[PDB]
């Protein structure tokens, strides 16, 4: 089998992407944030504290003939951005772009943190990291991908995120029309539960390529590109008027400035992020100071190839017995 679904930016800045997901019988369609950096499929629901729901579409398990309480199961998660959610668990039928998994753990939120409430466009998350990170207790649950894997034509999914435009998540096949050149595959460590790999280096604009190993994760659920302070400083030093602002919480720059591209290495191959992808707009409405899309990972404890990087590429998440990652230009 295969599946194919369009993913759409939630706003004009590509702060995140939402993908429609069918849950239950009859289908309840929720717009979920596909997150290769986590492993829980959780949803706003009829069980979510009323004061914490503000415009989201909710899953109502009592209206699904295929929903079953996963008796005794609870979940609780906290994300890198400080957000969190928790609740109980149902199993139900879940479909993404024509691909159906029966008995998928659907984690129903009883509580969500303010950032989730405040974002009316995201109805929940669909985790696509390794199932070892799943927070369901006492019985850890499998991701949608892990459940679908054996049925897929090939045990892979692909992320093809758009710049200020929709893109595509495919399951079970590689669309050879969706990228240029060849796909370069690179090793993955699953030891921390992430799609963790090692970039071979970077270049800033037309500058010479610096060969250096940069461990990091391929994370569709993170907006920006977070890299070591050395690398990030080298980038922003090429932008007139750029500075790191403690009050704003990262590098900012005047949008009268022109942003250089940023290149990252995948083996001997190179993915080029255009300068425009690194502009995240005014720090506040009407401000002449813009927020940068490349930021320091210092303090996070890991480098993160988030949407800024991933949307410059066609990315293969290869879930074979030995997982790997593939990157192609597009
Ligand atoms: C890219 C997006 C998620 N973040 C921002 C986007 C625009 C403006 C200001 C700040 C900002 N993050 C700060 C709070 C660290």
Alpha carbon distance 110, 155 (integer Å)? 33
Q: Which DSSP helix (H) or strand (E) runs through 145?
A: helix 144-148
* 238 Cα–ligand 1 center, Å: 21
The residue nearest atom 15 of ligand 1, judged by CA position, is 249
Atom of ligand 1 at shortest range from CA of 15: 3
CB 155, CB 143: distance < 8 Å: no
The residue nearest atom 13 of ligand 1, judged by CA position, is 249
CB 32, CB 125: distance < 8 Å: yes
Alpha carbon distance 139, 152 (integer Å)? 25
CB 168, CB 2: distance < 8 Å: no
Alpha carbon distance 108, 124 (integer Å)? 9
Q: Does one domain contain both 132 and 150?
A: yes
DSSP codes, 260-320: PPEEEEETTEEEEE-GGGGEEEESSTT-SEEEESEEE-TTTSS-EE-HHHHTTSEEEEE-S
The residue nearest atom 14 of ligand 1, judged by CA position, is 249
* 289 Cα–ligand 1 center, Å: 12
- Cβ < 6 A, ligand 1 pocket: 15, 223-224, 248-250, 280, 283, 291
Q: Which residues lie across from 324 on neighbouring strands?
A: 187, 318
Ligand 1, from 249, 284, 298: best to mutate by most atoms within 8 Å of Cβ? 249
Q: Solving technique for this entry?
A: X-ray
Look at residues 174, 209, 242 and tell me which one is the last residue of a structural domain: 174
* 248 Cα–ligand 1 center, Å: 8
* 223 Cα–ligand 1 center, Å: 9
Within 10 Å of residue 186's Cβ, how many Cβ atoms?
Answer: 17
- Range of 90's domain? 5-174
Q: Does one domain contain both 179 and 324?
A: yes
Q: Does one domain contain both 186 and 160?
A: no
Ligand 1, from 15, 225, 280: best to mutate by most atoms within 8 Å of Cβ? 280
Within 10 Å of residue 90's Cβ, how many Cβ atoms?
Answer: 25
Ligand 1, from 79, 250, 288: best to mutate by most atoms within 8 Å of Cβ? 250
Domain count, the chain: 2
CB-neighbour burial class of residue 264 (10 A; exposed 0-12, middle 13-18, buried 19+): buried
What Rg do the C-alpha atoms of the chain give, in angstroms? 20
CATH number of the domain encompassing residue 262: 2.40.70.10
Look at residues 122, 156, 174 and tell me which one is the last residue of a structural domain: 174
- Active-site residue numbers? 35, 199
* 74, 78, 271 from 40: Cα distances, Å: 12, 11, 29
Q: Does one domain contain both 287 and 318?
A: yes
Q: Does one domain contain both 58 and 186?
A: no
Q: Does one domain contain both 208 and 99?
A: no
What is the dihedral sign for C-alpha 82, 133, 328, 204? positive
Look at residues 174, 190, 206 and tell me which one is the last residue of a structural domain: 174
């Amino acid at each position: 089998s295969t599946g194919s679904a369009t993913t759409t930016p939630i706003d004009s800045l590509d702060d995140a992407y939402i993908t429609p997901v069918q849950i239950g019988t009859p289908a309840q369609t929720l717009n979920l944030d596909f997150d290769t950096g986590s492993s829980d499929l959780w949803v706003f629901s009829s069980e979510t504290t009323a004061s914490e729901v503000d415009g989201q579409t909710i899953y109502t398990p009592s209206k699904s003939t295929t929903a079953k309480l996963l008796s005794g199961a609870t979940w609780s998660i906290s994300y890198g951005d400080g957000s969190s959610s928790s609740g109980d668990v149902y199993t139900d039928t879940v479909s993404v772009g024509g691909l159906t998994v029966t008995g998928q753990a659907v984690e129903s939120a009883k509580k969500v943190s303010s950032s989730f409430t405040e974002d009316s466009t995201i109805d929940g998350l669909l985790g696509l990291a390794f199932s070892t990170l799943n927070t369901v207790s006492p019985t850890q649950q499998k991701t949608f991908f892990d459940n679908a894997k054996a049925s897929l034509d090939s045990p892979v999914f692909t992320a093809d995120l758009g710049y200020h435009a929709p893109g595509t998540y495919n399951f079970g096949f590689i669309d050879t029309t969706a990228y240029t050149g060849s796909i370069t595959y690179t090793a993955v460590s699953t030891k921390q539960g992430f799609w963790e790999w090692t970039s071979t280096g970077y270049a800033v604009g037309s500058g010479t390529f610096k060969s250096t190993s940069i461990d990091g994760i391929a994370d569709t659920g993170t907006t920006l590109l977070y890299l070591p302070a050395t690398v990030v400083s080298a980038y922003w030093a090429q932008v007139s008027g750029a500075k790191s602002s403690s009050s704003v919480g990262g590098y900012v720059f005047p949008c009268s400035a022109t942003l250089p591209s940023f290149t990252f290495g995948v083996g001997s191959a190179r993915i080029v992020i255009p300068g425009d992808y690194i502009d995240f707009g005014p720090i506040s409405t009407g401000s002449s100071s813009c927020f940068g899309g490349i930021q320091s990972s210092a303090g996070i404890g890991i480098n993160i190839f988030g949407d800024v990087a991933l949307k410059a590429a066609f990315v293969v998440f290869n879930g074979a017995t030995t997982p790997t990652l593939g990157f192609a230009s597009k």
